[PDB]
Amino acid sequence: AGWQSYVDNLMCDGCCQEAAIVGYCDAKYVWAATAGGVFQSITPIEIDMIVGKDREGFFTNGLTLGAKKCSVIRDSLYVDGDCTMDIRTKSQGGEPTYNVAVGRAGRALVIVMGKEGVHGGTLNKKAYELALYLRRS
Amino acid sequence: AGWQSYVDNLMCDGCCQEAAIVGYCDAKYVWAATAGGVFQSITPIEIDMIVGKDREGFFTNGLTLGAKKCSVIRDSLYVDGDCTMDIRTKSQGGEPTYNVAVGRAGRALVIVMGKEGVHGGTLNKKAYELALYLRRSD
Amino acid sequence: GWQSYVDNLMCDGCCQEAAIVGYCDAKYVWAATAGGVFQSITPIEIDMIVGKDREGFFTNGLTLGAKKCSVIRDSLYVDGDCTMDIRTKSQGGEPTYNVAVGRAGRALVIVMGKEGVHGGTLNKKAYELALYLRRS
Amino acid sequence: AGWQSYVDNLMCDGCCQEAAIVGYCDAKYVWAATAGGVFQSITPIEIDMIVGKDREGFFTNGLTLGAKKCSVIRDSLYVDGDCTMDIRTKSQGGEPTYNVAVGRAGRALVIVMGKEGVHGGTLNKKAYELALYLRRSD
Numbered sequence: 003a004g005w006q007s008y009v010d011n012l013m014c015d016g017c018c019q020e021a022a023i024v025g026y027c028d029a030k031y032v033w034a035a036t037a038g039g040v041f042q043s044i045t046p047i048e049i050d051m052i053v054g055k056d057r058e059g060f061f062t063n064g065l066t067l068g069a070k071k072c073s074v075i076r077d078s079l080y081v082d083g084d085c086t087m088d089i090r091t092k093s094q095g096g097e098p099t100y101n102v103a104v105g106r107a108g109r110a111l112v113i114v115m116g117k118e119g120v121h122g123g124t125l126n127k128k129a130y131e132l133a134l135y136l137r138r139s
Numbered sequence: 140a141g142w143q144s145y146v147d148n149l150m151c152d153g154c155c156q157e158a159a160i161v162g163y164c165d166a167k168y169v170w171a172a173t174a175g176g177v178f179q180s181i182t183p184i185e186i187d188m189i190v191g192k193d194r195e196g197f198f199t200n201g202l203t204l205g206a207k208k209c210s211v212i213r214d215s216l217y218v219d220g221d222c223t224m225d226i227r228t229k230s231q232g233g234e235p236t237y238n239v240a241v242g243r244a245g246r247a248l249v250i251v252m253g254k255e256g257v258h259g260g261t262l263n264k265k266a267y268e269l270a271l272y273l274r275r276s277d
Numbered sequence: 278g279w280q281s282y283v284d285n286l287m288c289d290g291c292c293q294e295a296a297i298v299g300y301c302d303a304k305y306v307w308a309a310t311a312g313g314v315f316q317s318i319t320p321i322e323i324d325m326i327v328g329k330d331r332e333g334f335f336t337n338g339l340t341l342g343a344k345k346c347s348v349i350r351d352s353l354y355v356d357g358d359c360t361m362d363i364r365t366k367s368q369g370g371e372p373t374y375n376v377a378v379g380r381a382g383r384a385l386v387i388v389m390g391k392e393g394v395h396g397g398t399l400n401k402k403a404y405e406l407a408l409y410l411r412r413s
Numbered sequence: 414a415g416w417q418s419y420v421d422n423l424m425c426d427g428c429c430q431e432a433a434i435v436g437y438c439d440a441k442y443v444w445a446a447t448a449g450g451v452f453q454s455i456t457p458i459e460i461d462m463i464v465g466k467d468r469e470g471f472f473t474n475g476l477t478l479g480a481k482k483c484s485v486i487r488d489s490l491y492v493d494g495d496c497t498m499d500i501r502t503k504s505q506g507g508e509p510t511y512n513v514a515v516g517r518a519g520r521a522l523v524i525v526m527g528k529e530g531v532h533g534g535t536l537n538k539k540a541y542e543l544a545l546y547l548r549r550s551d
Contacts (some may be wrong), residue, residue, distance in 0.1 A: 003425065003427065007425060010418055010421065011418075013414065014418060015220075017219060037529075076213075076259065078258060078263075080263070081260045081261050082258070082261045082411075084258075084260035084264045120219075120221070121215060121221070122215070123214075123215025124220045124221055126215070127215075127220045128220055130264070140288045141288075145279060145285070147281045148281050254315075268413050272409040273544065275405055350487075350533065350534065351534075352534025352537070352538075355535050356531075356532070356536065357428075358532070358535055358537065394493075395492040396487065396489070396493050397487060397495035397497065398493045398494045400489075400495065401495045
């Protein structure tokens with residue numbers, strides 16, 4: 003019912019270490035996120051970079067999510083028949099990189115970070131399905 | 140009971156130049172394909188490379204479809220919650236490349252080749268959607 | 278072509294008739310299986326199906342290609358659904374057949390099952406195609 | 414993650430006054446259900462009546478869910494392409510009847526009771542969708 007339950011739904015199958023529902027329109031802030039993760043720290047400026055008119059800048063300079071440096075693998079956020087972005091965190095102190103997927107609905111963004119080893123396709127479709135569901139709703 | 144029916148409905152929105160339904164189990168061959176395209180010439184050996192246990196050999200050496208040299212962008216064919224593969228044809232003398240998507244249903248493979256400029260995400264969800272429809276209709 | 282979707286619905290063999298009919302601007306049969314009553318669905322009949330009056334057809338019934346029918350369940354505009362469970366009427370010594378309507382964006386998927394084919398089978402058949410057309 | 418979360422998923426959109434996930438095979442009992450409702454009281458005997466070989470007895474004598482007398486509107490639990498039952502409670506002390514839908518997955522039953530005025534179609538598809546989802550998993 004609440005947005006936290008939507009995060010619960012995303013975290014249910016166990017392949018995500020974190021999940022979040024983030025507004026990108028007139029309620030541009032984190033609606034709900036996994037407690038204690040980095041998504042709780044996603045800023046309005048970071049959201050702008052994700053949904054911005056410029057779809058080439060993030061490929062050159064990357065982007066941050068909750069101040070976590072990431073790289074863009076594929077941008078399909080505004081392409082025909084899709085509404086996703088495949089991202090991957092940058093490895094720091096020997097840590098493994100993590101896949102991230104964004105699903106864009108009409109008012110919010112579905113963001114998921116996979117646990118170590120989880121494939122981008124799994125996250126892509128997870129993000130896609132909830133985005134589509136929110137769109138009909 | 141015609142699979143040529145499905146390829147027609149894949150060619151509707153006009154973003155594809157080719158479309159095909161290809162088996163990868165008992166009926167390892169093209170069931171239906173765009174007339175005049177390379178998908179029409181997909182050999183059993185090629186189907187094997189697509190659905191094989193080896194999910195690294197094609198990234199290293201690429202794969203072919205109807206003999207056309209291609210590269211694998213992403214493999215999500217057997218990964219949790221997905222059933223697609225993002226492919227892209229290679230250029231010989233500067234000609235435009237074309238994105239390709241594979242959608243794995245029960246015993247059938249949905250394969251679509253986009254026109255110039257059509258994004259992989261578009262084709263990925265195009266193949267994904269038809270595969271999902273086929274799976275749900277067990 | 279829409280005639281591709283109707284011949285698609287005839288694949289599994291549980292149906293004796295299938296059709297794609299418009300209910301908005303293009304209010305007429307787009308495609309139908311040849312030799313059946315569905316080819317003859319009129320705009321007046323499409324109006325009853327998709328009408329604002331969701332009680333009229335229960336009291337007096339409805340017709341598809343002039344075939345007299347009774348509405349079992351109306352889920353066309355209800356939340357989470359987009360179907361209608363119909364059943365043709367017997368005009369004497371004839372077996373009845375179930376019919377299901379699936380409402381997509383601007384189209385209407387209509388399927389008539391053969392004798393013995395249960396309504397739930399047809400309901401999900403229409404539901405699945407309507408869902409595919411919607412998501413796509 | 415747990416079973417109560419699946420119940421939470423079913424209750425999210427607000428059209429259900431109650432929801433539950435009930436095992437019908439080797440773990441034939443309520444796995445999770447809405448706190449304080451009637452589904453919490455679903456017995457193994459009631460479960461057997463729902464999934465039993467006899468698909469006609471319940472139309473004649475009705476059936477109970479948590480001791481609550483109900484009637485069967487439609488049985489599609491084992492028909493081709495479907496996996497649901499459309500049930501409806503019987504009105505007692507002037508109260509309104511409530512629609513109920515049962516969706517059958519491989520090992521469990523998705524059961525939902527609509528609020529006053531909620532249509533059978535809504536519950537039918539809600540139950541159908543989660544049962545199909547559970548099936549993709551088991």
